[PDB]
Design a protein around this ligand. Sequence first.
Ligand SMILES: CC(=O)N[C@H]1[C@H](O[C@H]2[C@@H](O)[C@@H](CO)O[C@@H](O[C@H]3[C@H](O)[C@@H](O)[C@H](O)O[C@@H]3CO)[C@@H]2O)O[C@H](CO)[C@@H](O)[C@@H]1O[C@@H]1O[C@H](CO)[C@H](O)[C@H](O)[C@H]1O
Length: 138
Amino acid sequence: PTFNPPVPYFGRLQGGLTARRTIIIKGYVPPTGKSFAINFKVGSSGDIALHINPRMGNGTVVRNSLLNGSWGSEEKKITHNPFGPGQFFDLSIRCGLDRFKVYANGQHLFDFAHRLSAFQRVDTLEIQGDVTLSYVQI
Ligand SMILES: CC(=O)N[C@H]1[C@H](O[C@H]2[C@@H](O)[C@@H](CO)O[C@@H](O[C@H]3[C@H](O)[C@@H](O)[C@H](O)O[C@@H]3CO)[C@@H]2O)O[C@H](CO)[C@@H](O)[C@@H]1O[C@@H]1O[C@H](CO)[C@H](O)[C@H](O)[C@H]1O
C-alpha cells in the first residue's frame, strides 16, 4: 500500500486532506496504456474534488470535479506532459487553502482551484486505470 501498490488503489486520508498536506505518487505509464485517473474523493463513493486524468491517446492532462452527480468544466492547460508512453513520473500534490498545487518531476504542472467546500471534506485517494505505481505516500 505504500510501495508497489496495485491498481485500483484505495487509500484513506486520515482526518481530512488539510492544507499543507502533500501527497506523493511515483509511477510508470505503460507503453500500451490509454488512460488513468487520480481521484481525490469524498468517501469511497461520493464526490470527486479533483479528478486528474492523463490520456495517452490525445496526450492531454484533464482536470475536473464530479460534484452532485455532474462533471464540471474541464481544465487542460499545461506547459509540459510528463505522462508520455513508457515514462516514469514523480507527482507531488499539495492541498492548498484555495487550490491544489501539483508538480511533476519537480516542475509545476498545474493549480486547480477548489470547487468543493472542503478544505477537508476530501478523505479518499483513488487511483485507477492504465498506470503502474512504484510509490504512494499518504
Ligand atoms: C466513460 C469513462 O471513462 N468513465 C470514467 C470517468 O470519466 C470521465 C471523466 O474523465 C470526465 C472528466 O471531465 O471526462 C469524461 O469524458 C468527457 C470528455 O472528456 C469530453 O471531452 C466530452 O465532451 O464529455 C465527456 C463526458 O463528460 C469521462 O467520461 O471518470 C471516473 C472517475 O475516474 C471513472 O470512474 C469512470 O469510469 C467508469 O466508471 C463507471 C462507474 O461509475 C463504470 O464502472 C465504467 O465501467 C467505468 O468506465
